[PDB]
Design a binder for these strands. Structure first.
Lengths: 171, 810, 128
RNA sequence: AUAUAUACAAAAUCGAGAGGA
């Protein structure tokens, strides 16, 4: 899911940036630091909307830098267990379907794909299908799926999907 | 284990590997195939790059299980002159495609039939079952059929249905079919109107205006009777845009009148400048797709994947033409309404369904054509490597080296058989060079090697060859490419074979081996998909599908290995050559290693070809497939004649005048023209049963010289080859006018600048302006590097004009 | 420990404000507007791209006001911000599909009340 | 138509005594 939350940070400002235009630098450093990263506590950090408060900048004794504590708000995308989201398959294997719920990558083991479907590598586009092909998931298809499990890897979240219950799968 | 039956079954190895297993044909299934294979594998593509023949071949492939080489070298008369080896490979490539299509067409047949049942239980299918599915000539139109179905009947599966996205079904909830029917002219019909480009079906007026019909259907999801008109238009739109006939005509239209627009993204305006590949099309406008050159779109699309460029395919109008159909004339004012609704319905169809899907379709088609070109090129390049004969076994000496600044030269004397005999390391200066030269001549005197080959790494190959020349005259010497040998060296196998040697000796052994017989060495060092792909076949190689590309490359190998044929014995006694057998048709890696096995195990040499099934357990079909292609230096075994033709060949031998007969013929062809092709052919109508004229023509040829090698004879590289080899960049890569960082060395009247390419750069005197005038230091200090622009080349001497003037730089 | 189906979250996503994929959409091209202009700025990350494309692919409302209205409509009824966003992002069709997709709506409303809720969603759902 | 090098900190503890300011 996508959210909008408030967060915490302290930046060290080298003395070259003391001078006019220094609060902009505190901004630009908050930008360049927090954005683009992913953290398991909050999930994918899409972007920072609006900062709130630049604290009092304490010169650190010795060593010059000033430490400004900052308050800010940002968008984050955080999946949760038992959630259902749309996902797009990018590639199909005999093991399962690799999908993405946006920036995050999700996987649906063969076991989690219903029993009717079989994997057909022989297809001109590889796909999972029923024998009659009444339902066929392949590349680029949108699907719904329950996020049954999520895991952290190098601050990167990837989910575990399931197509078990009613109203999931091929959209 | 799969390998066990594959080694054990009676079909050629490469037949079991294929995803769609090969099942026999019917001769009506086969004719329909062959028609399809013709049309699709021999219709003009969208970018600028007999059926009975295909029939016969497919018959061979799918019913008798002859592999493309056996068809090509032993059923020529069936398929020649109109199918060649590459053609047959293409035919078997497309037979897979046929089968996929047949299998999906079947599946859809059942699905449709089930739905017909269910409908009978309770629009409907009448001919569209027949008309559409049976007439699906392509996977594309199959999706049209399929999605078309899913629109209407997809709702009903007899888990839950997983509601759709397109909100057609929300409309279909509220009877919006009522309106859509009440727009005139059912979508089948409209597609027909397009198909004929004139209003074959008139429309149906109604005795009301749209709004009044809307009051009927405006309920809940749609209040506000305009909203129901929207739903109605949208309904009409999907129905239009899913209709296969509409799709056919519009797919065609895109094929024919498709333009390509390109602009650069923020990221692209900056970093696409005159040396980036995309420079030529950073801005395109109305480029018609018919003009995209061989690999050009592959580049375009890559450049888009790099995000530095943004593209779109369209026609521009077409909408204007189209709207003339679903239309009416009289100006009632209660039809200008319906006409207006009708029009904007078609807008929505085209504008948000068809144009988009057709653009993706075309892009994929183009892109994939481009891919294919690139594969084709890589194949062509490898063909060229492999199609070069051995030199005129031979003791070859092979010299390799490196940057050489404090690094020595090793040379390796590699026997005729290909096994390395002995090696020599060849490391104020002038006396050092002199001593080396002396020991070289000592080596060359001692062990007279037929051919001395010198790697190509850089200019130094030139000096190296010339010193060796200077030596030998007092027996050839040849520059030789070094690209495969680099690969050998780096590979783990070279370690395996020579634990002791240093790596550059490993190049030395390679470069000697390759000169001796390039096919063998390629096959040995291109042992796995990764290995082969390390070679640089085409600059874009990296982007085409690994599977397809490996296929083409392996097929090239298969081709030549069969022409060359393989001597099993030598592959035994000198285990270097074992790699070949994999490519012999009828065999494979599994089957091949097996054959080598049994032969090893038994500790016997293949005295004969019938010794194969006799002494090994290979089944009839493989012996037929392969046996042709196994030299055995029973004299007819060492010849391309198949064992099934030994009788004909002996007969011809008698008709020359039978051990004396054959050996006389082999000693000389007493009368080549003793034979009468027509007469042998005529008899073959009752003894042999076929128009086997060409087969005879070949057998005569083969009686001339047992396994005459058909590779082209070696030629030392043309100076263009020398250039692009030692410098290692292409005629394209010396873009005259390229900008290059060069290093200045010293005014020998000129300004001698050394390129990183190992190329001398002569800024000319005109820019220099000093021949008898003061030295040009004031323009530039000696020592440093500058970057300038080429304005002429001297490949035959490795010199390139350059430019001072930033006027030239601009 | 966190469970959407059982309506369980860690304490941080309690005062968190949810979004609808279309809200995220419009904001992400808002940020494209900021990025494309104002040169000498870092290009947006491939993560930003993936989320952009995704939410673009599934933004069921293409008009700011419509999104707002959707939201507001979901506000006036006692609903959790989670279910708020799940309903609006998934756009379920029938009440029973909602329950399957958002079990946390178990027993909350009546299926018919909910149904005309869903219908209100759908009727506000903008054509594109 | 030429031109040779690159490794890293070695040296302890306890006790006594004698001195220095």
């Amino acid at each position: 899911m996508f959210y909008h939350i408030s967060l915490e940070h302290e930046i060290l400002l080298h003395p070259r940036y003391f001078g006019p235009n220094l609060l902009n630098t505190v901004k630009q450093k908050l930008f360049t630091e927090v954005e683009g990263t992913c953290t398991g506590k909050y999930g994918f950090v899409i972007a920072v909307t609006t900062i709130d408060n630049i604290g009092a900048g304490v010169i650190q004794p010795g060593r010059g830098f000033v430490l400004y504590p900052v308050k800010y708000k940002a968008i984050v995308f955080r999946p949760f267990k038992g959630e259902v989201v749309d996902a797009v398959v990018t590639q199909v294997n005999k093991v399962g379907l690799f999908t993405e719920i946006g920036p995050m990558s999700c996987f649906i083991s063969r076991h989690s794909i219903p029993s009717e479907m079989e994997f057909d590598p022989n297809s001109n586009p590889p796909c999972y299908k029923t024998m009659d092909e009444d339902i066929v998931i392949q590349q680029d298809d949108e699907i719904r799926l329950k996020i049954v499990g999520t895991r952290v890897d190098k601050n990167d979240i990837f989910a575990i999907g399931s197509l078990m219950d009613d109203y999931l799968g091929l959209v | 284990d799969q390998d066990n039956e594959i080694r054990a079954t009676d079909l050629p190895e490469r037949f079991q590997l294929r995803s769609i297993p090969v099942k026999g044909a019917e001769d009506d299934e086969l004719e329909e195939e062959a028609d399809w294979i013709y049309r699709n594998a021999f219709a003009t593509p969208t970018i600028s790059l007999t059926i009975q023949k295909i029939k016969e071949a497919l018959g061979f492939m799918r019913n008798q299980h002859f592999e493309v080489p056996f068809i090509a070298f032993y059923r020529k008369e069936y398929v020649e002159p109109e199918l060649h080896i590459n053609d047959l490979w293409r035919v078997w490539q497309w037979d897979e495609k046929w089968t996929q299509l047949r299998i999906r067409k079947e599946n859809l047949t059942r699905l449709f039939e089930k739905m017909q049942a269910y409908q009978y239980e309770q629009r409907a299918l009448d001919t569209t079952d027949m008309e559409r599915l049976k007439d699906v000539q392509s996977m594309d139109e199959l999706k049209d059929v399929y999605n078309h179905f899913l629109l209407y009947y997809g709702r009903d599966i007899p888990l839950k249905q997983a509601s759709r996205r397109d909100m057609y079904t929300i409309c279909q909830s509220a009877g919006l079919d009522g309106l859509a029917k009440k727009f005139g002219l059912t979508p089948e019909q409209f597609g027909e109107n397009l198909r004929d480009s004139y209003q074959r079906h008139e429309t149906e007026q109604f005795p009301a205006e749209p709004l009044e019909l809307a009051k009927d259907y405006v309920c809940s999801q749609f209040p506000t009777p305009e909203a129901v008109l929207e739903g109605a238009r949208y309904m009409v739109a999907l129905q239009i845009a899913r209709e296969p006939l509409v799709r056919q005509v519009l797919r065609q239209t895109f094929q024919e009148r498709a333009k390509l627009n390109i602009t650069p993204t923020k990221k692209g305006r900056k970093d696409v400048d005159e040396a980036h590949y995309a420079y030529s099309f950073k801005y395109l406008k109305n480029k018609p797709v018919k003009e995209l050159r061989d690999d050009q779109f592959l580049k375009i699309c890559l450049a888009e994947d790099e995000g530095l460029l943004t593209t779109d395919i369209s026609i521009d109008t077409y909408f204007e033409e189209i709207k003339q159909f679903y239309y009416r004339d009289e100006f009632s004012h209660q039809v200008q309404e319906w006409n207006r609704q009708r029009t904007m319905a078609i807008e929505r169809a085209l504008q948000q369904f068809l144009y988009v899907q057709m653009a993706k379709e075309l892009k994929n088609k183009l892109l994939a054509e481009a891919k294919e070109y690139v594969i084709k090129a890589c194949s062509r390049k490898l063909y060229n490597w492999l199609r070069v004969a051995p030199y005129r076994g031979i003791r070859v000496l092979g010299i390799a080296f490196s940057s050489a600044r404090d690094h020595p030269v090793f040379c390796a004397l590699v026997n005729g058989e290909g096994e390395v005999t002995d090696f020599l390391r060849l490391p104020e200066e002038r006396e050092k060079k002199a001593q080396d030269i002396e020991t070289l001549k000592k080596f060359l005197l001692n062990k007279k090697p037929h051919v001395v080959t010198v790697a190509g790494e850089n200019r130094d190959a030139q000096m190296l060859i010339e010193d060796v020349k200077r030596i030998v005259h007092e027996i050839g010497v040849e520059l030789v490419d070094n690209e495969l040998a680099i690969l050998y060296m780096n590979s783990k196998k070279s370690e395996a074979e020579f634990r002791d040697y240093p790596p550059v000796l490993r190049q030395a052994v390679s470069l000697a081996r390759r000169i001796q017989d390039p096919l063998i060495e390629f096959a040995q060092v291109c042992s796995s998909d990764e290995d082969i792909l390390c070679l640089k076949f085409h600059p874009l190689q990296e982007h085409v599908v690994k599977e397809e590309l490996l296929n083409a490359l392996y097929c090239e190998f298969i081709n030549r290995v069969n022409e060359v044929g393989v001597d099993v014995n030598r592959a035994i006694a000198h285990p270097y050559s074992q790699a070949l057998i994999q490519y012999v048709c009828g065999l494979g890696p599994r089957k091949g290693t097996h054959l080598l096995k049994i032969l090893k195990q038994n500790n016997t040499r293949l005295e004969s070809r019938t010794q194969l099934v006799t002494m090994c357990h290979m089944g009839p079909k493989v012996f037929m497939n392969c046996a042709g292609f196994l030299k055995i230096d029973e004299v007819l075994d060492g010849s391309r004649v198949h064992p099934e033709t030994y009788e004909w060949a002996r007969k011809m031998a008698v008709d020359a005048l039978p051990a004396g007969a054959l050996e006389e013929i082999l000693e000389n062809p007493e009368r080549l023209k003793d034979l009468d092709l027509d007469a042998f052919a005529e008899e073959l109508e009752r003894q042999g049963y076929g128009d086997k004229h060409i087969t005879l023509y070949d057998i005569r040829a083969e009686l001339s010289c047992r396994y005459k090698d058909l590779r082209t004879a070696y030629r030392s590289p043309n100076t263009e080859e020398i250039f692009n080899m030692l410098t290692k960049e292409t005629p394209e890569t010396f873009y005259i006018g390229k900008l290059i960082i060069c290093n200045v060395t010293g005014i020998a009247i000129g300004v001698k600048t050394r390129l990183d390419n190992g190329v001398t750069g002569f800024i000319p005197t005109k820019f220099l302006s000093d021949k008898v005038v003061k030295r040009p230091e004031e323009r530039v200090k000696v020592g440093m590097t500058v970057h300038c622009r080429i304005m002429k080349i001297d490949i035959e001497k490795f010199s390139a004009d350059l430019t001072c003037r930033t006027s030239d730089l601009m | 420990e966190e469970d959407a189906s059982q309506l369980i979250f860690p304490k941080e996503f309690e005062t968190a404000e949810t979004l609808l994929n279309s809200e995220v959409h419009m904001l992400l091209e808002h940020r494209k507007q900021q990025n494309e202009s104002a040169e000498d700025e870092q290009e947006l990350s491939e993560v930003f791209m993936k989320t952009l494309n995704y939410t673009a692919r599934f933004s069921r409302f293409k008009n700011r006001e419509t999104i707002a209205s959707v939201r507001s409509l979901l506000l006036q009824k006692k609903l959790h911000k989670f279910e708020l966003a799940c309903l609006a992002n998934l756009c379920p069709e029938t009440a029973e599909e909602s329950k399957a997709l958002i079990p946390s709506l178990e027993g909350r409303f009546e299926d018919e009340e909910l149904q005309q809720i869903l219908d209100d969603i759908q009727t506000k759902r903008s054509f594109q």
